[PDB]
Design a protein around this ligand. Structure first.
Ligand SMILES: [Mg+2]
Ligand SMILES: [Mg+2]
Ligand SMILES: [Mg+2]
Ligand SMILES: [Mg+2]
Ligand SMILES: [Mg+2]
Ligand SMILES: [Zn+2]
Ligand SMILES: [Zn+2]
Ligand SMILES: [Zn+2]
Ligand SMILES: [Zn+2]
Ligand SMILES: [Zn+2]
Ligand SMILES: [Zn+2]
Lengths: 103, 103
DNA sequence: CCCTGTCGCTGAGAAGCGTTTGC
DNA sequence: CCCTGTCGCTGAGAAGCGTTTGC
C-alpha cells in the first residue's frame, strides 16, 4: 500500500509546477485520483508539493505543500523544488507535524 | 502486504495441531501456500506455530516454531498454544532474533 | 484583528526465499 | 562430540478522508 518514492530531478522541474505551487491553503483543489497528500496538513490536493531527494526516504512523507513548508519550516517549495540536496523534515528529524512531534 | 493477525482461542486448539508441532528443525515441510513463517528462523513451513494473544500485535511476528521457541526462549509451543495470556517475545521486548537483537 | 494559519482518526506498523541451522 | 541447533538479503518501513486551518 506504500506509494513508491521517486526522486524527480531538478532538471525535469517545469514552470507549470511553480505556477501551481499553493499560496493559500483555502485555495486548494481536492482530487482523490490526481491529487498528492502533504505530509504536514494531510490534505490530498493538486497543488505542487516538495520532492525529497534523499534515496533512503520512502512513501509520501517527503511531500509538503506551499503553506505548510512556508509556515512550519520557513522554506519555500519553489526553493525546495530547485534544491538537488533538499531533504524532507522527517529525514532531517525536524518534522513538527502532529504525529512526528510526539514520537 | 501485511498478513492480518487473528487470535486463535485456546478452546479452538485441536490435537492435530499439537501432533504437528515441530520437534526437529530438519524434519520440517516447506510449503509456499499453506506454510507459516516462524519469526525467529524465518522458515515458511507447515508445522504448528505459536499464536500471539496480544491484541496490539500485528503480522506474523508472533509466530514461532517448535525448535525456535524451545531453544531461544525455553518455552514449549504446546504450552504457548494453551496459554490464553501468552505474548510473543517481540511483544515482550525480549526477542533475540538476528533483526530484533541489534535494534 | 493580524505574519491568511491545522489536528483526529483509521489502519498502519512485511514477509520469506536464499545466501540459512551449535563448540 | 554434545542439550539436534541458524542468519543474510530484499524490500520493507501508509496514506488520506474527516472530525481539519492562527491569539
Ligand atoms: Mg504495507
Ligand atoms: Mg481511510
Ligand atoms: Mg490493522
Ligand atoms: Mg522476496
Ligand atoms: Mg523499497
Ligand atoms: Zn500541507
Ligand atoms: Zn525524505
Ligand atoms: Zn511528520
Ligand atoms: Zn523457527
Ligand atoms: Zn505479539
Ligand atoms: Zn525478532
Amino acid at each position: 500500500m506504500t506509494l513508491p518514492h521517486i526522486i524527480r530531478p531538478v532538471e525535469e522541474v517545469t514552470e507549470e509546477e511553480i505556477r501551481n505551487i499553493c499560496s493559500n491553503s483555502r485555495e486548494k483543489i481536492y482530487n482523490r485520483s490526481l491529487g498528492s497528500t502533504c505530509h504536514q496538513c494531510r490534505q490530498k490536493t493538486t497543488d505542487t508539493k516538495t520532492n525529497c531527494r534523499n534515496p533512503d526516504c520512502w512513501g509520501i512523507r517527503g511531500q509538503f505543500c506551499g503553506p505548510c513548508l512556508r509556515n512550519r519550516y520557513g522554506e519555500e517549495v519553489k526553493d525546495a523544488l530547485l534544491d538537488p540536496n533538499w531533504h524532507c523534515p522527517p529525514c532531517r528529524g525536524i518534522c513538527n507535524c502532529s504525529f512526528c512531534r510526539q514520537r
